[PDB]
Amino acid sequence: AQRRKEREELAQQYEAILRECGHGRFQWTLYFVLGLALMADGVEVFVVGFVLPSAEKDMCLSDSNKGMLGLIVYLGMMVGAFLWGGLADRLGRRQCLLISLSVNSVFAFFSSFVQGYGTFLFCRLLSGVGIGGSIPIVFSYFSEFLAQEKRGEHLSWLCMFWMIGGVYAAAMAWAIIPHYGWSFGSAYQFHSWRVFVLVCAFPSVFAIGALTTQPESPRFFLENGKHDEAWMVLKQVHDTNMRAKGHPERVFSVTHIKTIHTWYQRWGVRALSLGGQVWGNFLSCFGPEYRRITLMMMGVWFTMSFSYYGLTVWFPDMIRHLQAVDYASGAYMVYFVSFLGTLAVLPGNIVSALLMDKIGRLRMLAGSSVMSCVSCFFLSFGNSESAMIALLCLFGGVSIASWNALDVLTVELYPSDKRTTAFGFLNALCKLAAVLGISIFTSFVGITKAAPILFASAALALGSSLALKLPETRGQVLQ
Numbered sequence: 406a407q408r409r410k411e412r413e414e415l416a417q418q419y420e421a422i423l424r425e426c427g428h429g430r431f432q433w434t435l436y437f438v439l440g441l442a443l444m445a446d447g448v449e450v451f452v453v454g455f456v457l458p459s460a461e462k463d464m465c466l467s468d469s470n471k472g473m474l475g476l477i478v479y480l481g482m483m484v485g486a487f488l489w490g491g492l493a494d495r496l497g498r499r500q501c502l503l504i505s506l507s508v509n510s511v512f513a514f515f516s517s518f519v520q521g522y523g524t525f526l527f528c529r530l531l532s533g534v535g536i537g538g539s540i541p542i543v544f545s546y547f548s549e550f551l552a553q554e555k556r557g558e559h560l561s562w563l564c565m566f567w568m569i570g571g572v573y574a575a576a577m578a579w580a581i582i583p584h585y586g587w588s589f590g591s592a593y594q595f596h597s598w599r600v601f602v603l604v605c606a607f608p609s610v611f612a613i614g615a616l617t618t619q620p621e622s623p624r625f626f627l628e629n630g631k632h633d634e635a636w637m638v639l640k641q642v643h644d645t646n647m648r649a650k651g652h653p654e655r656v657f658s659v660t661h662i663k664t665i666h667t668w669y670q671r672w673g674v675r676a677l678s679l680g681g682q683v684w685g686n687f688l689s690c691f692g693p694e695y696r697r698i699t700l701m702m703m704g705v706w707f708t709m710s711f712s713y714y715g716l717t718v719w720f721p722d723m724i725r726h727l728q729a730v731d732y733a734s735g736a737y738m739v740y741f742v743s744f745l746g747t748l749a750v751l752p753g754n755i756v757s758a759l760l761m762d763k764i765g766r767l768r769m770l771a772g773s774s775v776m777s778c779v780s781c782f783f784l785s786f787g788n789s790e791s792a793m794i795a796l797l798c799l800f801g802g803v804s805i806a807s808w809n810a811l812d813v814l815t816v817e818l819y820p821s822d823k824r825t826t827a828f829g830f831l832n833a834l835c836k837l838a839a840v841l842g843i844s845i846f847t848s849f850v851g852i853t854k855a856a857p858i859l860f861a862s863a864a865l866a867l868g869s870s871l872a873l874k875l876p877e878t879r880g881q882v883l884q
């Protein structure tokens with residue numbers, strides 16, 4: 406009873422404080438700084454999806470082992486997503502983002518000097534574990550600096566760095582190791598997978614470097630009884646915004662803010678308490694206050710991730726199959742298609758950013774899901790390479806909007822003391838759905854074109870049937 410009242414007072418006051426701070430230089434700087442972190446995740450996703458299996462096929466491996474790396478690394482991503490989402494609530498957004506990025510960068514760096522297959526697999530799996538927490542923590546961290554008046558518009562532009570990271574990974578793959586053989590012989594003569602591995606780590610390293618300049622979120626401090634730190638961070642935000650706008654004379658007027666109140670021996674108690682608190686936060690997502698919302702968000706996330714990841718990983722393979730069939734009558738194609746998809750997303754990002762705060766998140770999600778279901782089905786009508794590429798561009802442009810709406814809903818549907826936990830759980834479910842979709846769809850490449858498309862269409866139809874039942878978060882203070 407009492408705690409809900411106090412947290413409602415804090416939520417009401419936080420939006421007023423943010424309106425006093427306003428939007429400007431600080432938010433955009435933080436936007437770029439976290440865009441680097443999302444770029445790291447996009448790079449890892451591309452590497453796992455496309456580089457590793459191609460390498461395995463180009464590797465001295467038994468037929469039974471031609472697809473293990475992607476599966477195991479995605480499972481590691483799932484585990485890391487849940488782990489880092491759970492901890493971010495208790496340790497902080499910036500702290501957990503730094504730790505996860507550090508793990509990712511370190512184990513990426515190690516993977517360059519491995520010599521076997523098990524060791525490279527191990528290093529890359531731990532790297533996947535590290536990066537898995539980037540998306541939940543980034544989306545929870547940035548949204549806490551945004552006022553309700555334009556939170557949806559500003560959150561819709563984060564996904565571009567994911568696309569740019571994927572394009573970067575594809576371009577580096579083409580430039581350094583274009584459909585070369587893979588061995589663990591090359592002597593790291595630039596044109597070796599080791600250098601590509603090292604190059605792909607740069608976005609994460611730069612994200613770590615830049616991230617150490619930004620301030621921890623004030624909402625986390627206020628939710629945990631740290632008044633003075635939150636006040637200083639909010640004053641920093643206000644001063645930066647006003648000094649950049651040409652009004653340095655202004656004074657931050659907020660007086661007081663509502664707040665909510667041997668080594669092997671100490672570490673044991675600390676770890677047990679952290680685990681208990683994280684598990685308690687997780688179970689709260691299934692209580693009577695949130696059980697329905699969580700159960701429907703699970704379905705929406707699962708279906709959307711299934712369809713999207715399955716189609717994206719299946720499309721290059723079926724293009725290669727079409728080319729092979731025509732010939733019977735490589736690495737550049739993936740990069741070109743990635744660049745085209747990144748261009749196609751941009752109109753969708755513009756439209757979603759414009760309409761998110763006007764038509765609401767629910768209508769964006771539902772309409773975009775219906776359009777994605779229809780456009781994905783149109784893939785069955787394409788016959789030539791160009792037609793397939795154009796239809797996929799249409800699918801991506803109409804689908805990216807639903808992802809922005811889903812991200813905004815996931816941010817706004819859960820309270821600030823459990824936001825990262827719920828987002829991490831749903832992102833782990835998304836990674837599991839990606840595993841299942843990539844495993845199922847790719848098996849049909851040499852058999853039939855219709856089955857993957859129909860499965861994706863049915864999954865998107867089911868997902869769009871659930872999106873209509875979620876509540877609308879438009880025009881409400883950040884929980």
Ligand SMILES: COc1ccccc1NC(=O)C[C@H](C)Cc1cc(C)cc(C)c1
Pocket residue numbers: 447448450451454567568569570571572717718720721742743744745746747749794797798800801
């Ligand atoms: C932007 O590229 C990435 C960014 C981050 C992770 C992976 C990838 N790329 C892929 O998965 C390959 C795939 C073919 C790209 C693509 C997707 C969509 C919806 C539409 C088009 C036209 C292309």
Ligand SMILES: CC[C@@H](C(N)=O)N1CCCC1=O
Pocket residue numbers: 443540563564567713808809812
């Ligand atoms: C940050 C981008 C990310 C997301 N919305 O969580 N995306 C884009 C489509 C596939 C995916 O996971």
